[PDB]
Amino acid sequence: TSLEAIVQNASSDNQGIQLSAVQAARKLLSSDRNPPIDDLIKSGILPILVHCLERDDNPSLQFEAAWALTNIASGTSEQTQAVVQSNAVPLFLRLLHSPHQNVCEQAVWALGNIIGDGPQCRDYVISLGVVKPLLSFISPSIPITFLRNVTWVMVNLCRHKDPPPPMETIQEILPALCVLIHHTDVNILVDTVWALSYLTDAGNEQIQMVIDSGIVPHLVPLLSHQEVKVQTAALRAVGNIVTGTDEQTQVVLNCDALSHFPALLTHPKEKINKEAVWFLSNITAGNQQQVQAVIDANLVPMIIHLLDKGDFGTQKEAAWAISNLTISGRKDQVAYLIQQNVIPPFCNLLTVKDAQVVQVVLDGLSNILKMAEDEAETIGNLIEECGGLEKIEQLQNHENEDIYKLAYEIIDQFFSS
Amino acid sequence: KRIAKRRSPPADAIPKSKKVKVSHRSHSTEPGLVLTLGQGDVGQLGLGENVMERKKPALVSIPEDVVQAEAGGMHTVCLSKSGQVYSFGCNDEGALGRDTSVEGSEMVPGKVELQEKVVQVSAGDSHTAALTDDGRVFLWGSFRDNNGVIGLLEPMKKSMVPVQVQLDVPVVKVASGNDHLVMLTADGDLYTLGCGEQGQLGRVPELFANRGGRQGLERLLVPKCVMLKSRGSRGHVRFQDAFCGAYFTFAISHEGHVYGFGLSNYHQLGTPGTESCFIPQNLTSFKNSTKSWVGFSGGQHHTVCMDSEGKAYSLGRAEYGRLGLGEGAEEKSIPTLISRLPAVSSVACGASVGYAVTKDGRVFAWGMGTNYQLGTGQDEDAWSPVEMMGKQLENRVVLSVSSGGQHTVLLVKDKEQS
């Protein structure tokens, strides 16, 4: 209840006073709420925590200290920076070898916070050699909670794509993830799949590593898993994978990924619909073979259905799917799309306030009309039937340079009589 | 021509970063052993299939050490050192959160179907709530009222297994009445959920009263804070601590003031009148500059509290010796000192009884002895704070105490000598 007493009580030689002062410190989450940040950072309490973190044969002291540093590093980035300036990290790493499980777990927790702060802090913590000791903890005799914290730290390691995580670090993590992906717990699986998600969102290179880890055939079937969260995470991960090159996407496809999507396209959660239609919107942008692989899965009718009766986001992603298939697909493929009654719902989006969607739809229609030559009459009359031509004629206004210019180019080119 | 692949907008960032490890002065840390006593009709004593009753404390077999023990209405929940939760009692409403298909498995303690490191537990009439280290709250069982079942989170639906109360803010303390639950967060915000028929929620004023449809239940079973006009001050009123009576709730703020709300039919809220308090009324009966309130507890119609100096007070209904003041003293609406009590370390209340724990380790009981909750071995109603005695108390000190409907559970530790 006093603001600064501890600094004297923690400097004593009586292990009870010191043990108690750091415990009453451990009560900081509530203690901190009353005073603002600055004063306690200035007076100097933090170094005191580290000094006492060094001394072994007194595990309670180390536990209370690492608790305090833990809850301090949870705050703003400036607070975590204040923690790392104390050079406390090598002492946490020293604590990773402690025989007391509570000390190890607390250290793993705090390192989790520090790593999760930012990419520079992450590269700092890796530069000291935390990855191999952390991964060495994975054993069939590990407690479940401690394992959950370990995986959490893995997720923090894989985050922050701005500077991507080090190559060697990922090369060390991936096998552990391949071991964790078979685990029975739900939360552990979730965190693992999110770690994969960040690894794949990093870029094409890391995606290629994930594919080289042989984990994709084990990841894909999770799309149809019972728990919704595993589904969401797996879908984001795989989608990031197919954001890459052609052959990589083809590796996703060869594991029979499309078979799971009919369910995902009809799943009650709106976010899963959105993310799945996003996925397919990346698939149609691939080569002709992949587009044909989408058509062969009977998925186009549900894509259009969501394009007509889905929410705004899913409608957007579906519009992207149609346009990508339009510029990438063959003539007979776009023909199949047309004979699936895609023109009316695809055109009914021209009335939205989002200029990007309008550019997508107009570009798609323009590409369709440029593609089909003899039936350009027929298709034109099709747009005239669904009233889309009226919408295009009223789109020629000053909302956007591209919408008007492209719009009237379409009109004059394909709709002159 | 081919278009380039599209990237995803950032997501909700579920695993976002640096989750806080909660700490609060209510978290029990010192390990101990569990004792039970009273009616064990449905196995809330955890002593065996053939054990129906114990009139003095008996030891319960737990494979690990126990850091906390709380006794529900007709069940009992223990929190082990390792973090796992053990439950034993009545599983008719799912308050145990584990498979009791095998008859006889509810009669003994069993490991709850949950894999977490739990730091706090709270148990009421028909429910059980756990608080993990990272701050997220689990809850299982069901709620009730003077009326039929009202569900747990989805109205008219009970839960047989632990279910997370998904909240963005970490929670530092959980506290349970009979059929309501309060959660004190780190930021000081105080969330409530459960029944509010008698106003034990505080955030649902006189605008309605027991709407027997899906409308009111739809508003009640969602965790929401209690907003208060801080009289000049911006933001909202913060809170330092909180406690749950049976059908009422108290809370201590940083300003030192004491708030409370619920049913005051027998003046068990310190209010002069029997009017129901649906608003967190500031209690003038507790306003004192010298006295600083630290510990609260309460039964279905009585209330026991304690100050920073160790003196434990009591108020509320007086029948059946639940106050324990003067061997038949009249009903009291104000906190009354019990001169027979030494320096009290912590206080607690049962259904119709009350328990005190002194700093030296002694435990005193008082109230209705129909269920032999008093530990005296006499069903006679005790009006005096009689000391509890038994062989399992020899050379041992009482760490904590909790009491429910037909039983009572203690947490004790061997003395430091030898």
Side-chain angles (χ1 to χ4, degrees), chain A residues 26 29 33-34 67 71 75 106 109 113 148 159 242-244 246 249 282 317 324, chain B residues 2-3 5-6 8 15-16 18-19 21-23 115-117 133 186 188 239 254:
Chain A
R26 185 272 299 177
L29 302 178
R33 179 175 61 197
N34 315 333
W67 195 288
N71 292 332
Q106 190 67 40
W109 198 283
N113 295 332
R148 290 183 178 179
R159 194 183 295 274
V242 301
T243 60
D246 292 331
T249 301
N282 286 319
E317 296 294 328
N324 290 319
Chain B
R2 296 180 68 250
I3 273 174
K5 298 291 180 68
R6 293 178 61 248
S8 69
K16 183 185 288 291
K18 63 191 176 183
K19 57 186 179 180
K21 194 172 182 69
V22 297
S23 179
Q115 293 178 356
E116 287 290 330
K117 184 174 175 66
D133 59 358
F239 288 98
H254 292 86

mmCIF file of all heavy atoms in Angstrom, chain A residues 26 29 33-34 67 71 75 106 109 113 148 159 242-244 246 249 282 317 324, chain B residues 2-3 5-6 8 15-16 18-19 21-23 115-117 133 186 188 239 254:
data_model
loop_
_atom_site.group_PDB
_atom_site.id
_atom_site.type_symbol
_atom_site.label_atom_id
_atom_site.label_comp_id
_atom_site.label_asym_id
_atom_site.label_seq_id
_atom_site.Cartn_x
_atom_site.Cartn_y
_atom_site.Cartn_z
ATOM 1 N N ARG A 26 4.587 -8.704 -6.085
ATOM 2 C CA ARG A 26 3.952 -9.622 -7.025
ATOM 3 C C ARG A 26 2.494 -9.215 -7.101
ATOM 4 O O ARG A 26 1.768 -9.672 -7.991
ATOM 5 C CB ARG A 26 4.162 -11.109 -6.615
ATOM 6 C CG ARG A 26 3.645 -12.179 -7.590
ATOM 7 C CD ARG A 26 2.178 -12.582 -7.370
ATOM 8 N NE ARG A 26 1.902 -13.166 -6.048
ATOM 9 C CZ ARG A 26 0.684 -13.532 -5.621
ATOM 10 N NH1 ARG A 26 -0.365 -13.423 -6.416
ATOM 11 N NH2 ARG A 26 0.498 -14.037 -4.418
ATOM 12 N N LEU A 29 -0.250 -6.031 -10.252
ATOM 13 C CA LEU A 29 -1.282 -5.853 -11.282
ATOM 14 C C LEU A 29 -2.370 -4.935 -10.735
ATOM 15 O O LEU A 29 -2.869 -4.052 -11.432
ATOM 16 C CB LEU A 29 -1.878 -7.201 -11.687
ATOM 17 C CG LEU A 29 -0.891 -8.242 -12.217
ATOM 18 C CD1 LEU A 29 -1.605 -9.547 -12.536
ATOM 19 C CD2 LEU A 29 -0.161 -7.713 -13.443
ATOM 20 N N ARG A 33 -2.484 -0.330 -10.922
ATOM 21 C CA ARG A 33 -3.668 0.344 -11.443
ATOM 22 C C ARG A 33 -3.875 1.708 -10.800
ATOM 23 O O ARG A 33 -4.429 2.614 -11.433
ATOM 24 C CB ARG A 33 -4.890 -0.541 -11.225
ATOM 25 C CG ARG A 33 -6.212 0.044 -11.697
ATOM 26 C CD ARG A 33 -7.283 -0.994 -11.534
ATOM 27 N NE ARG A 33 -7.442 -1.390 -10.139
ATOM 28 C CZ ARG A 33 -8.062 -2.491 -9.731
ATOM 29 N NH1 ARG A 33 -8.567 -3.340 -10.613
ATOM 30 N NH2 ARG A 33 -8.155 -2.750 -8.435
ATOM 31 N N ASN A 34 -3.424 1.890 -9.569
ATOM 32 C CA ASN A 34 -3.725 3.142 -8.894
ATOM 33 C C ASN A 34 -2.765 4.250 -9.339
ATOM 34 O O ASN A 34 -3.225 5.348 -9.677
ATOM 35 C CB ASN A 34 -3.696 2.934 -7.380
ATOM 36 C CG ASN A 34 -4.429 1.683 -6.970
ATOM 37 O OD1 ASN A 34 -5.337 1.241 -7.667
ATOM 38 N ND2 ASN A 34 -4.048 1.108 -5.834
ATOM 39 N N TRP A 67 7.612 -13.263 -11.949
ATOM 40 C CA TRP A 67 6.209 -12.875 -12.016
ATOM 41 C C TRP A 67 6.083 -11.381 -12.272
ATOM 42 O O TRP A 67 5.341 -10.944 -13.161
ATOM 43 C CB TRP A 67 5.509 -13.216 -10.709
ATOM 44 C CG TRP A 67 4.025 -13.196 -10.781
ATOM 45 C CD1 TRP A 67 3.228 -12.100 -10.889
ATOM 46 C CD2 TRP A 67 3.149 -14.303 -10.548
ATOM 47 N NE1 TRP A 67 1.909 -12.465 -10.844
ATOM 48 C CE2 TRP A 67 1.833 -13.815 -10.624
ATOM 49 C CE3 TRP A 67 3.352 -15.666 -10.327
ATOM 50 C CZ2 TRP A 67 0.723 -14.640 -10.487
ATOM 51 C CZ3 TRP A 67 2.249 -16.484 -10.183
ATOM 52 C CH2 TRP A 67 0.951 -15.970 -10.269
ATOM 53 N N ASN A 71 4.493 -9.442 -15.566
ATOM 54 C CA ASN A 71 3.349 -8.551 -15.654
ATOM 55 C C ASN A 71 3.743 -7.151 -16.089
ATOM 56 O O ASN A 71 2.889 -6.407 -16.580
ATOM 57 C CB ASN A 71 2.637 -8.492 -14.314
ATOM 58 C CG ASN A 71 1.977 -9.792 -13.966
ATOM 59 O OD1 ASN A 71 1.594 -10.559 -14.845
ATOM 60 N ND2 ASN A 71 1.814 -10.043 -12.672
ATOM 61 N N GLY A 75 2.715 -4.691 -20.666
ATOM 62 C CA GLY A 75 2.157 -3.389 -20.978
ATOM 63 C C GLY A 75 2.567 -2.879 -22.342
ATOM 64 O O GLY A 75 2.746 -3.647 -23.290
ATOM 65 N N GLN A 106 7.468 -19.825 -15.550
ATOM 66 C CA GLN A 106 7.375 -18.377 -15.464
ATOM 67 C C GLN A 106 8.343 -17.710 -16.428
ATOM 68 O O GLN A 106 8.011 -16.697 -17.058
ATOM 69 C CB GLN A 106 7.654 -17.934 -14.042
ATOM 70 C CG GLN A 106 7.360 -16.495 -13.807
ATOM 71 C CD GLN A 106 5.898 -16.215 -13.917
ATOM 72 O OE1 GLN A 106 5.078 -17.004 -13.463
ATOM 73 N NE2 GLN A 106 5.553 -15.076 -14.494
ATOM 74 N N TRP A 109 6.987 -17.871 -19.807
ATOM 75 C CA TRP A 109 5.928 -16.879 -19.921
ATOM 76 C C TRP A 109 6.510 -15.509 -20.259
ATOM 77 O O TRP A 109 6.132 -14.882 -21.259
ATOM 78 C CB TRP A 109 5.159 -16.814 -18.610
ATOM 79 C CG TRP A 109 3.829 -16.177 -18.671
ATOM 80 C CD1 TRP A 109 3.569 -14.853 -18.727
ATOM 81 C CD2 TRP A 109 2.571 -16.823 -18.485
ATOM 82 N NE1 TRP A 109 2.221 -14.626 -18.680
ATOM 83 C CE2 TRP A 109 1.583 -15.825 -18.521
ATOM 84 C CE3 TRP A 109 2.181 -18.155 -18.331
ATOM 85 C CZ2 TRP A 109 0.228 -16.113 -18.411
ATOM 86 C CZ3 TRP A 109 0.833 -18.442 -18.223
ATOM 87 C CH2 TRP A 109 -0.127 -17.425 -18.264
ATOM 88 N N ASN A 113 6.187 -12.874 -23.456
ATOM 89 C CA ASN A 113 5.796 -11.471 -23.555
ATOM 90 C C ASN A 113 6.815 -10.683 -24.361
ATOM 91 O O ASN A 113 6.470 -9.991 -25.331
ATOM 92 C CB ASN A 113 5.645 -10.868 -22.164
ATOM 93 C CG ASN A 113 4.523 -11.495 -21.382
ATOM 94 O OD1 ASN A 113 3.556 -11.985 -21.946
ATOM 95 N ND2 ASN A 113 4.652 -11.490 -20.065
ATOM 96 N N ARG A 148 1.042 -25.521 -23.422
ATOM 97 C CA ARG A 148 0.266 -24.458 -24.048
ATOM 98 C C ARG A 148 1.032 -23.145 -24.051
ATOM 99 O O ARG A 148 1.022 -22.414 -25.050
ATOM 100 C CB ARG A 148 -1.076 -24.296 -23.345
ATOM 101 C CG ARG A 148 -2.013 -25.455 -23.581
ATOM 102 C CD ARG A 148 -3.364 -25.237 -22.932
ATOM 103 N NE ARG A 148 -4.269 -26.349 -23.206
ATOM 104 C CZ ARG A 148 -5.514 -26.428 -22.751
ATOM 105 N NH1 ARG A 148 -6.005 -25.454 -22.001
ATOM 106 N NH2 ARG A 148 -6.271 -27.473 -23.054
ATOM 107 N N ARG A 159 5.389 -14.501 -35.458
ATOM 108 C CA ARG A 159 4.614 -13.311 -35.776
ATOM 109 C C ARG A 159 5.518 -12.275 -36.453
ATOM 110 O O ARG A 159 6.671 -12.551 -36.794
ATOM 111 C CB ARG A 159 3.968 -12.790 -34.494
ATOM 112 C CG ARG A 159 2.868 -11.753 -34.649
ATOM 113 C CD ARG A 159 2.393 -11.296 -33.284
ATOM 114 N NE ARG A 159 1.756 -12.373 -32.540
ATOM 115 C CZ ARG A 159 0.473 -12.687 -32.660
ATOM 116 N NH1 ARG A 159 -0.297 -11.994 -33.486
ATOM 117 N NH2 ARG A 159 -0.041 -13.681 -31.953
ATOM 118 N N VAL A 242 -1.760 -20.622 -50.570
ATOM 119 C CA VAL A 242 -2.092 -20.444 -51.982
ATOM 120 C C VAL A 242 -1.968 -19.002 -52.435
ATOM 121 O O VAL A 242 -2.151 -18.723 -53.625
ATOM 122 C CB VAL A 242 -3.508 -20.938 -52.320
ATOM 123 C CG1 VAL A 242 -3.631 -22.396 -51.976
ATOM 124 C CG2 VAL A 242 -4.540 -20.112 -51.595
ATOM 125 N N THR A 243 -1.667 -18.072 -51.535
ATOM 126 C CA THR A 243 -1.290 -16.753 -52.027
ATOM 127 C C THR A 243 0.048 -16.752 -52.738
ATOM 128 O O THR A 243 0.487 -15.688 -53.171
ATOM 129 C CB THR A 243 -1.237 -15.747 -50.886
ATOM 130 O OG1 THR A 243 -0.278 -16.184 -49.918
ATOM 131 C CG2 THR A 243 -2.588 -15.602 -50.240
ATOM 132 N N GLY A 244 0.705 -17.897 -52.869
ATOM 133 C CA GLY A 244 2.031 -17.946 -53.442
ATOM 134 C C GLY A 244 2.068 -18.187 -54.933
ATOM 135 O O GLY A 244 1.269 -17.625 -55.686
ATOM 136 N N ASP A 246 2.260 -20.751 -58.498
ATOM 137 C CA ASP A 246 1.313 -21.717 -59.038
ATOM 138 C C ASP A 246 1.518 -23.093 -58.423
ATOM 139 O O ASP A 246 0.590 -23.669 -57.848
ATOM 140 C CB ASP A 246 1.454 -21.787 -60.555
ATOM 141 C CG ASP A 246 1.013 -20.519 -61.234
ATOM 142 O OD1 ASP A 246 0.132 -19.830 -60.681
ATOM 143 O OD2 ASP A 246 1.547 -20.211 -62.319
ATOM 144 N N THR A 249 0.298 -23.574 -54.769
ATOM 145 C CA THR A 249 -1.141 -23.773 -54.769
ATOM 146 C C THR A 249 -1.483 -25.180 -55.227
ATOM 147 O O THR A 249 -2.335 -25.847 -54.631
ATOM 148 C CB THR A 249 -1.803 -22.743 -55.673
ATOM 149 O OG1 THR A 249 -1.501 -21.429 -55.205
ATOM 150 C CG2 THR A 249 -3.274 -22.919 -55.638
ATOM 151 N N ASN A 282 -8.336 -16.783 -54.742
ATOM 152 C CA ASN A 282 -6.934 -16.964 -55.084
ATOM 153 C C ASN A 282 -6.716 -18.164 -55.988
ATOM 154 O O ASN A 282 -5.715 -18.205 -56.705
ATOM 155 C CB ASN A 282 -6.080 -17.112 -53.832
ATOM 156 C CG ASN A 282 -5.894 -15.812 -53.115
ATOM 157 O OD1 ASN A 282 -5.688 -14.776 -53.738
ATOM 158 N ND2 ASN A 282 -5.954 -15.853 -51.793
ATOM 159 N N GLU A 317 -15.380 -10.665 -51.995
ATOM 160 C CA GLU A 317 -14.429 -11.718 -52.334
ATOM 161 C C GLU A 317 -14.923 -12.565 -53.499
ATOM 162 O O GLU A 317 -14.133 -12.982 -54.355
ATOM 163 C CB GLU A 317 -14.163 -12.589 -51.113
ATOM 164 C CG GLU A 317 -13.505 -11.837 -49.974
ATOM 165 C CD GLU A 317 -12.096 -11.380 -50.306
ATOM 166 O OE1 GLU A 317 -11.409 -12.080 -51.077
ATOM 167 O OE2 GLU A 317 -11.676 -10.322 -49.792
ATOM 168 N N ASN A 324 -11.216 -12.813 -61.422
ATOM 169 C CA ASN A 324 -9.979 -13.558 -61.626
ATOM 170 C C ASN A 324 -10.200 -14.710 -62.595
ATOM 171 O O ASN A 324 -9.410 -14.916 -63.523
ATOM 172 C CB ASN A 324 -9.441 -14.071 -60.295
ATOM 173 C CG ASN A 324 -8.929 -12.962 -59.415
ATOM 174 O OD1 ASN A 324 -8.275 -12.038 -59.885
ATOM 175 N ND2 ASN A 324 -9.227 -13.045 -58.125
ATOM 176 N N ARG B 2 -2.252 -12.667 -66.540
ATOM 177 C CA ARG B 2 -2.638 -13.317 -65.297
ATOM 178 C C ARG B 2 -2.578 -12.303 -64.165
ATOM 179 O O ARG B 2 -1.676 -11.460 -64.126
ATOM 180 C CB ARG B 2 -1.728 -14.504 -64.970
ATOM 181 C CG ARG B 2 -1.801 -15.627 -65.982
ATOM 182 C CD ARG B 2 -0.877 -16.772 -65.625
ATOM 183 N NE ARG B 2 -1.312 -17.461 -64.417
ATOM 184 C CZ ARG B 2 -0.673 -17.414 -63.258
ATOM 185 N NH1 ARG B 2 0.468 -16.750 -63.159
ATOM 186 N NH2 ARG B 2 -1.148 -18.074 -62.214
ATOM 187 N N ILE B 3 -3.528 -12.392 -63.248
ATOM 188 C CA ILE B 3 -3.593 -11.455 -62.144
ATOM 189 C C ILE B 3 -2.734 -12.018 -61.021
ATOM 190 O O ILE B 3 -2.490 -13.223 -60.940
ATOM 191 C CB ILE B 3 -5.062 -11.209 -61.712
ATOM 192 C CG1 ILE B 3 -5.671 -10.082 -62.545
ATOM 193 C CG2 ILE B 3 -5.205 -10.860 -60.235
ATOM 194 C CD1 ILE B 3 -7.153 -9.867 -62.303
ATOM 195 N N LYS B 5 -1.677 -12.724 -56.955
ATOM 196 C CA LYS B 5 -2.442 -13.304 -55.866
ATOM 197 C C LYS B 5 -2.708 -12.259 -54.795
ATOM 198 O O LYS B 5 -1.870 -11.400 -54.515
ATOM 199 C CB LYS B 5 -1.675 -14.477 -55.260
ATOM 200 C CG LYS B 5 -1.402 -15.643 -56.200
ATOM 201 C CD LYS B 5 -2.677 -16.376 -56.549
ATOM 202 C CE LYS B 5 -2.420 -17.551 -57.482
ATOM 203 N NZ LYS B 5 -1.657 -18.661 -56.850
ATOM 204 N N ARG B 6 -3.891 -12.340 -54.199
ATOM 205 C CA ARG B 6 -4.354 -11.342 -53.250
ATOM 206 C C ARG B 6 -4.014 -11.752 -51.828
ATOM 207 O O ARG B 6 -4.110 -12.927 -51.468
ATOM 208 C CB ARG B 6 -5.866 -11.158 -53.380
ATOM 209 C CG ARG B 6 -6.304 -10.556 -54.692
ATOM 210 C CD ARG B 6 -7.815 -10.447 -54.777
ATOM 211 N NE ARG B 6 -8.383 -9.592 -53.742
ATOM 212 C CZ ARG B 6 -9.140 -10.039 -52.747
ATOM 213 N NH1 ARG B 6 -9.419 -11.329 -52.658
ATOM 214 N NH2 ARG B 6 -9.618 -9.196 -51.844
ATOM 215 N N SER B 8 -4.528 -11.235 -47.580
ATOM 216 C CA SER B 8 -5.659 -11.129 -46.667
ATOM 217 C C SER B 8 -5.548 -9.889 -45.792
ATOM 218 O O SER B 8 -4.443 -9.490 -45.415
ATOM 219 C CB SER B 8 -5.761 -12.355 -45.761
ATOM 220 O OG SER B 8 -4.688 -12.394 -44.845
ATOM 221 N N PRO B 15 -4.555 -14.927 -30.912
ATOM 222 C CA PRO B 15 -3.451 -15.161 -29.964
ATOM 223 C C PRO B 15 -2.662 -13.887 -29.677
ATOM 224 O O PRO B 15 -1.457 -13.966 -29.423
ATOM 225 C CB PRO B 15 -2.497 -16.066 -30.759
ATOM 226 C CG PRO B 15 -3.319 -16.666 -31.833
ATOM 227 C CD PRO B 15 -4.291 -15.589 -32.202
ATOM 228 N N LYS B 16 -3.326 -12.732 -29.662
ATOM 229 C CA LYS B 16 -2.620 -11.503 -30.017
ATOM 230 C C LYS B 16 -1.209 -11.316 -29.471
ATOM 231 O O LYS B 16 -0.259 -11.302 -30.259
ATOM 232 C CB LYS B 16 -3.448 -10.306 -29.546
ATOM 233 C CG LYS B 16 -2.865 -8.956 -29.917
ATOM 234 C CD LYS B 16 -3.681 -7.831 -29.305
ATOM 235 C CE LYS B 16 -5.020 -7.675 -29.995
ATOM 236 N NZ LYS B 16 -4.845 -7.169 -31.381
ATOM 237 N N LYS B 18 1.408 -11.133 -25.444
ATOM 238 C CA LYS B 18 1.690 -10.824 -24.044
ATOM 239 C C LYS B 18 0.483 -10.784 -23.105
ATOM 240 O O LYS B 18 0.123 -9.733 -22.566
ATOM 241 C CB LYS B 18 2.504 -9.521 -24.009
ATOM 242 C CG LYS B 18 1.808 -8.279 -24.554
ATOM 243 C CD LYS B 18 2.809 -7.147 -24.717
ATOM 244 C CE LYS B 18 2.164 -5.931 -25.353
ATOM 245 N NZ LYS B 18 3.152 -4.841 -25.576
ATOM 246 N N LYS B 19 -0.134 -11.939 -22.898
ATOM 247 C CA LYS B 19 -1.251 -12.043 -21.973
ATOM 248 C C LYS B 19 -0.775 -11.909 -20.529
ATOM 249 O O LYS B 19 0.306 -12.376 -20.163
ATOM 250 C CB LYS B 19 -1.989 -13.357 -22.226
ATOM 251 C CG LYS B 19 -1.127 -14.596 -22.106
ATOM 252 C CD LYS B 19 -1.903 -15.836 -22.504
ATOM 253 C CE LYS B 19 -1.036 -17.075 -22.419
ATOM 254 N NZ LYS B 19 -1.794 -18.292 -22.805
ATOM 255 N N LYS B 21 -0.619 -12.290 -16.436
ATOM 256 C CA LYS B 21 -0.774 -13.287 -15.384
ATOM 257 C C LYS B 21 -1.376 -12.593 -14.165
ATOM 258 O O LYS B 21 -0.715 -11.770 -13.526
ATOM 259 C CB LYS B 21 0.583 -13.912 -15.068
ATOM 260 C CG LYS B 21 0.558 -15.180 -14.244
ATOM 261 C CD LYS B 21 1.959 -15.776 -14.193
ATOM 262 C CE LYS B 21 2.006 -17.077 -13.419
ATOM 263 N NZ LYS B 21 1.298 -18.182 -14.107
ATOM 264 N N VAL B 22 -2.625 -12.926 -13.834
ATOM 265 C CA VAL B 22 -3.351 -12.197 -12.799
ATOM 266 C C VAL B 22 -2.787 -12.502 -11.420
ATOM 267 O O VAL B 22 -2.321 -13.615 -11.144
ATOM 268 C CB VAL B 22 -4.851 -12.528 -12.848
ATOM 269 C CG1 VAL B 22 -5.434 -12.075 -14.148
ATOM 270 C CG2 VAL B 22 -5.064 -14.007 -12.668
ATOM 271 N N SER B 23 -2.814 -11.493 -10.547
ATOM 272 C CA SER B 23 -2.455 -11.639 -9.145
ATOM 273 C C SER B 23 -3.412 -10.820 -8.294
ATOM 274 O O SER B 23 -3.721 -9.673 -8.625
ATOM 275 C CB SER B 23 -1.017 -11.189 -8.885
ATOM 276 O OG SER B 23 -0.690 -11.314 -7.509
ATOM 277 N N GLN B 115 -8.438 -28.928 -18.782
ATOM 278 C CA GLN B 115 -6.980 -28.946 -18.804
ATOM 279 C C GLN B 115 -6.498 -27.503 -18.784
ATOM 280 O O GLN B 115 -6.245 -26.902 -19.829
ATOM 281 C CB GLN B 115 -6.476 -29.707 -20.022
ATOM 282 C CG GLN B 115 -6.800 -31.197 -19.987
ATOM 283 C CD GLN B 115 -6.341 -31.933 -21.233
ATOM 284 O OE1 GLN B 115 -5.839 -31.326 -22.182
ATOM 285 N NE2 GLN B 115 -6.513 -33.251 -21.239
ATOM 286 N N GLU B 116 -6.363 -26.951 -17.581
ATOM 287 C CA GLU B 116 -5.905 -25.583 -17.396
ATOM 288 C C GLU B 116 -5.121 -25.489 -16.097
ATOM 289 O O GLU B 116 -5.112 -26.413 -15.280
ATOM 290 C CB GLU B 116 -7.072 -24.591 -17.376
ATOM 291 C CG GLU B 116 -7.716 -24.335 -18.712
ATOM 292 C CD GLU B 116 -6.810 -23.562 -19.642
ATOM 293 O OE1 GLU B 116 -5.996 -22.759 -19.141
ATOM 294 O OE2 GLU B 116 -6.923 -23.740 -20.874
ATOM 295 N N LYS B 117 -4.448 -24.356 -15.922
ATOM 296 C CA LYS B 117 -3.815 -23.999 -14.657
ATOM 297 C C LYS B 117 -4.731 -22.985 -13.986
ATOM 298 O O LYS B 117 -4.735 -21.804 -14.339
ATOM 299 C CB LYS B 117 -2.413 -23.441 -14.878
ATOM 300 C CG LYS B 117 -1.670 -23.142 -13.586
ATOM 301 C CD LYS B 117 -0.232 -22.725 -13.845
ATOM 302 C CE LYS B 117 0.460 -22.305 -12.555
ATOM 303 N NZ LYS B 117 0.621 -23.440 -11.600
ATOM 304 N N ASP B 133 -4.971 -18.718 -14.815
ATOM 305 C CA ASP B 133 -3.863 -17.804 -14.579
ATOM 306 C C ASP B 133 -3.880 -16.630 -15.547
ATOM 307 O O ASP B 133 -3.552 -15.506 -15.162
ATOM 308 C CB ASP B 133 -2.546 -18.564 -14.668
ATOM 309 C CG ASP B 133 -2.352 -19.229 -16.002
ATOM 310 O OD1 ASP B 133 -3.264 -19.138 -16.847
ATOM 311 O OD2 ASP B 133 -1.289 -19.850 -16.206
ATOM 312 N N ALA B 186 -8.955 -6.682 -14.071
ATOM 313 C CA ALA B 186 -7.761 -5.922 -13.714
ATOM 314 C C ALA B 186 -8.049 -4.429 -13.712
ATOM 315 O O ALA B 186 -7.700 -3.718 -12.763
ATOM 316 C CB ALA B 186 -6.621 -6.251 -14.673
ATOM 317 N N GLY B 188 -10.458 -2.834 -12.982
ATOM 318 C CA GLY B 188 -11.416 -2.412 -11.989
ATOM 319 C C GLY B 188 -12.865 -2.543 -12.401
ATOM 320 O O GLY B 188 -13.748 -2.397 -11.549
ATOM 321 N N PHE B 239 -13.091 -0.506 -8.782
ATOM 322 C CA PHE B 239 -13.281 -1.385 -7.641
ATOM 323 C C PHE B 239 -12.002 -2.135 -7.316
ATOM 324 O O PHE B 239 -11.259 -2.549 -8.208
ATOM 325 C CB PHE B 239 -14.428 -2.361 -7.874
ATOM 326 C CG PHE B 239 -15.775 -1.715 -7.834
ATOM 327 C CD1 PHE B 239 -16.423 -1.356 -8.996
ATOM 328 C CD2 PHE B 239 -16.381 -1.441 -6.624
ATOM 329 C CE1 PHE B 239 -17.659 -0.755 -8.952
ATOM 330 C CE2 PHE B 239 -17.617 -0.846 -6.572
ATOM 331 C CZ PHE B 239 -18.258 -0.500 -7.737
ATOM 332 N N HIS B 254 -11.488 1.691 -4.666
ATOM 333 C CA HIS B 254 -10.255 2.360 -4.261
ATOM 334 C C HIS B 254 -10.530 3.512 -3.306
ATOM 335 O O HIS B 254 -9.690 3.823 -2.453
ATOM 336 C CB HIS B 254 -9.494 2.860 -5.487
ATOM 337 C CG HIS B 254 -8.948 1.765 -6.347
ATOM 338 N ND1 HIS B 254 -9.689 1.152 -7.333
ATOM 339 C CD2 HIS B 254 -7.728 1.178 -6.372
ATOM 340 C CE1 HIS B 254 -8.951 0.230 -7.926
ATOM 341 N NE2 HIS B 254 -7.757 0.226 -7.362
#
